[PDB]
Design an enzyme around this catalytic site. Structure first.
Site, PDB file in Angstrom:
ATOM      1  N   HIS A  42      37.510  53.740  42.017  1.00  0.00           N
ATOM      2  CA  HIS A  42      37.254  52.791  40.925  1.00  0.00           C
ATOM      3  C   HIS A  42      36.197  53.286  39.927  1.00  0.00           C
ATOM      4  O   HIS A  42      36.182  52.838  38.779  1.00  0.00           O
ATOM      5  CB  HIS A  42      36.911  51.389  41.467  1.00  0.00           C
ATOM      6  CG  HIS A  42      35.505  51.235  41.959  1.00  0.00           C
ATOM      7  ND1 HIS A  42      35.168  51.492  43.274  1.00  0.00           N
ATOM      8  CD2 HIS A  42      34.401  50.814  41.300  1.00  0.00           C
ATOM      9  CE1 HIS A  42      33.873  51.239  43.367  1.00  0.00           C
ATOM     10  NE2 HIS A  42      33.369  50.833  42.203  1.00  0.00           N
ATOM     11  N   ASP A  88      40.177  53.204  48.110  1.00  0.00           N
ATOM     12  CA  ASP A  88      39.081  53.481  47.182  1.00  0.00           C
ATOM     13  C   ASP A  88      38.309  54.738  47.610  1.00  0.00           C
ATOM     14  O   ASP A  88      37.136  54.669  47.991  1.00  0.00           O
ATOM     15  CB  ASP A  88      38.163  52.246  47.046  1.00  0.00           C
ATOM     16  CG  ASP A  88      37.251  52.232  45.832  1.00  0.00           C
ATOM     17  OD1 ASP A  88      37.515  52.997  44.876  1.00  0.00           O
ATOM     18  OD2 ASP A  88      36.296  51.427  45.818  1.00  0.00           O
ATOM     19  N   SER A 185      27.859  51.616  43.933  1.00  0.00           N
ATOM     20  CA  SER A 185      29.285  51.907  44.129  1.00  0.00           C
ATOM     21  C   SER A 185      29.619  53.398  44.088  1.00  0.00           C
ATOM     22  O   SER A 185      29.209  54.106  43.166  1.00  0.00           O
ATOM     23  CB  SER A 185      30.128  51.137  43.121  1.00  0.00           C
ATOM     24  OG  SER A 185      29.739  51.424  41.787  1.00  0.00           O
ATOM     25  N   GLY A 186      30.330  53.852  45.118  1.00  0.00           N
ATOM     26  CA  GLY A 186      30.707  55.249  45.299  1.00  0.00           C
ATOM     27  C   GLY A 186      29.687  56.033  46.103  1.00  0.00           C
ATOM     28  O   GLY A 186      29.950  57.174  46.494  1.00  0.00           O
TER      29      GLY A 186
HETATM   30  C1  VYR Z   1      35.322  39.987  44.507  1.00  0.00           C
HETATM   31  C2  VYR Z   1      34.647  41.264  44.005  1.00  0.00           C
HETATM   32  C3  VYR Z   1      34.981  41.547  42.522  1.00  0.00           C
HETATM   33  C4  VYR Z   1      36.174  42.219  42.154  1.00  0.00           C
HETATM   34  N1  VYR Z   1      37.140  42.622  43.111  1.00  0.00           N
HETATM   35  C5  VYR Z   1      36.995  43.961  43.775  1.00  0.00           C
HETATM   36  C6  VYR Z   1      37.987  44.183  44.938  1.00  0.00           C
HETATM   37  O1  VYR Z   1      38.804  43.056  45.369  1.00  0.00           O
HETATM   38  C7  VYR Z   1      39.225  42.194  44.290  1.00  0.00           C
HETATM   39  C8  VYR Z   1      38.271  41.793  43.358  1.00  0.00           C
HETATM   40  O2  VYR Z   1      38.394  40.697  42.810  1.00  0.00           O
HETATM   41  C9  VYR Z   1      36.472  42.481  40.811  1.00  0.00           C
HETATM   42  C10 VYR Z   1      35.594  42.104  39.799  1.00  0.00           C
HETATM   43  C11 VYR Z   1      34.415  41.449  40.141  1.00  0.00           C
HETATM   44  C12 VYR Z   1      34.105  41.159  41.475  1.00  0.00           C
HETATM   45  S1  VYR Z   1      32.544  40.344  41.764  1.00  0.00           S
HETATM   46  O3  VYR Z   1      32.749  39.081  42.547  1.00  0.00           O
HETATM   47  O4  VYR Z   1      31.915  39.963  40.452  1.00  0.00           O
HETATM   48  N2  VYR Z   1      31.529  41.337  42.598  1.00  0.00           N
HETATM   49  C13 VYR Z   1      31.152  42.537  41.828  1.00  0.00           C
HETATM   50  C14 VYR Z   1      29.662  42.860  42.070  1.00  0.00           C
HETATM   51  C15 VYR Z   1      29.407  44.136  42.875  1.00  0.00           C
HETATM   52  C16 VYR Z   1      29.422  44.242  44.207  1.00  0.00           C
HETATM   53  C17 VYR Z   1      29.140  45.499  44.533  1.00  0.00           C
HETATM   54  C18 VYR Z   1      29.091  46.092  45.787  1.00  0.00           C
HETATM   55  C19 VYR Z   1      29.683  47.233  46.157  1.00  0.00           C
HETATM   56  C20 VYR Z   1      29.517  47.571  47.447  1.00  0.00           C
HETATM   57  C21 VYR Z   1      28.730  46.744  48.129  1.00  0.00           C
HETATM   58 CL1  VYR Z   1      28.312  46.957  49.790  1.00  0.00          CL
HETATM   59  S2  VYR Z   1      28.260  45.484  47.122  1.00  0.00           S
HETATM   60  O5  VYR Z   1      28.976  46.229  43.400  1.00  0.00           O
HETATM   61  N3  VYR Z   1      29.146  45.327  42.343  1.00  0.00           N
HETATM   62  C22 VYR Z   1      32.129  43.707  42.124  1.00  0.00           C
HETATM   63  O6  VYR Z   1      32.525  43.868  43.281  1.00  0.00           O
HETATM   64  N4  VYR Z   1      32.637  44.490  41.140  1.00  0.00           N
HETATM   65  C23 VYR Z   1      33.624  45.570  41.464  1.00  0.00           C
HETATM   66  C24 VYR Z   1      33.095  46.952  41.036  1.00  0.00           C
HETATM   67  C25 VYR Z   1      32.271  46.936  39.709  1.00  0.00           C
HETATM   68  O7  VYR Z   1      32.887  47.707  38.659  1.00  0.00           O
HETATM   69  C26 VYR Z   1      32.160  48.931  38.450  1.00  0.00           C
HETATM   70  C27 VYR Z   1      31.584  45.634  39.183  1.00  0.00           C
HETATM   71  C28 VYR Z   1      32.242  44.340  39.701  1.00  0.00           C
END
Ligand code: VYR
Ligand code: CA
Lengths: 234, 52
Positions: A42, A88, A185-186
């Site tokens: 990602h 991923d 992340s990563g």
């Molecule tokens: C439910 C998680 C999710 C998603 N995903 C990811 C995978 O499954 C489906 C989905 O909805 C997508 C957008 C936002 C969110 S979120 O609820 O706002 N959480 C966010 C916040 C977040 C969480 C983390 C973590 C990564 C590893 C951890 Cl351990 S915690 O890093 N950022 C998120 O997961 N994102 C995905 C990657 C990133 O892009 C570079 C930023 C957003």
């Protein structure tokens, strides 16, 4: 990283930082050997073309031991899906070999059977990165580390509102405000056995940062160990 | 029994094959004379928290 402590001299030498055209860091990485870097699939959507930074602990000022390496081959997993974050995993090949020193050292790739029987059965794991200090906050200028305990599969599935595949695993706390965040992340997830650290996971996703009743989702390295070895030949 | 009890006295990996423990090491390490300990082949081996 939400909470925890910062990486000291030689504490986190397997850490790699993915940088864009403006030297800004967007994703983490793990050093495997002189030419190979392990990251999340990602992360290859944030910025392209990108570069790899090694031996970095502080972003606002250059440190004696920092090095910039350019990517030659980008081995992204074909089965990656942005809708769930399944498969991923990404392996990066560099143009120039990495010189190992105080802040630059690789992390051992464990054997599939031994990692499932000995490493996965361990109480805790260690995560690192230049990520956010708070869920809505800014990215940390200093490299931080955190001791995250292993969470059982049943408790992992019941807590998540999103699907948890066989290539995913839970690690962290239930109510305590200590978890990885955006920017980590990563990055690496290492498990300690005696005095040697092994690659066990990749920082993937999570329902917010350090939320009560929610854990951190990581890419299970054990399911891709045969794929990583094949990627290291080409 | 064997790999289940104290990792079969191995420094790294443990695997059973028709009785008796067999120890193995990762890339950048060499198996010691005792056939249990892992000795580094270079100054900076993998998974070690550096000081120098
Ligand atoms: C439910 C998680 C999710 C998603 N995903 C990811 C995978 O499954 C489906 C989905 O909805 C997508 C957008 C936002 C969110 S979120 O609820 O706002 N959480 C966010 C916040 C977040 C969480 C983390 C973590 C990564 C590893 C951890 Cl351990 S915690 O890093 N950022 C998120 O997961 N994102 C995905 C990657 C990133 O892009 C570079 C930023 C957003
Ligand atoms: Ca720096």
């Amino acid at each position: 990283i939400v909470g925890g402590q910062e990486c000291k001299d030689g504490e986190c030498p397997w850490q790699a930082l993915l940088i864009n055209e403006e030297n800004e860091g967007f994703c983490g990485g793990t050093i495997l050997s002189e030419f190979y870097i392990l990251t999340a699939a990602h992360c290859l959507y944030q910025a392209k073309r990108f570069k790899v930074r090694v031996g970095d602990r502080n972003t606002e000022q250059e440190e004696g031991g920092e090095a910039v390496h350019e990517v030659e081959v980008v081995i992204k997993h074909n089965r990656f899906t942005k809708e769930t974050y399944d498969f991923d995993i990404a392996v990066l090949r560099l143009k120039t070999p990495i010189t190992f020193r105080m802040n630059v050292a690789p992390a051992c790739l464990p054997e599939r059977d031994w990692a499932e029987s000995t490493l996965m059965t361990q109480k805790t794991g260690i995560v690192s990165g230049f990520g956010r200090t708070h869920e809505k906050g800014r990215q940390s200028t200093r490299l931080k580390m955190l001791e995250v305990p292993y969470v059982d599969r049943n408790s992992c599935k019941l807590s998540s509102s999103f699907i948890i595949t066989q290539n995913m695993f839970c690690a962290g706390y239930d109510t305590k405000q200590e978890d990885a965040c955006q920017g980590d992340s990563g990055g690496p997830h290492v498990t300690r056995f005696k005095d040697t650290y092994f690659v066990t996971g990749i920082v993937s996703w999570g329902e917010g940062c350090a939320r009560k009743g929610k854990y951190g989702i990581y890419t299970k390295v054990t399911a891709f160990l045969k794929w990583i070895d094949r990627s290291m030949k080409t | 029994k064997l790999c289940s009890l104290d990792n079969g006295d191995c420094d790294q990996f443990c695997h059973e094959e028709q009785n008796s423990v067999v120890c193995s090491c990762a890339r950048g390490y060499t198996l010691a004379d005792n056939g249990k300990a892992c000795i580094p082949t270079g100054p900076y081996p993998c998974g070690k928290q550096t000081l120098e």
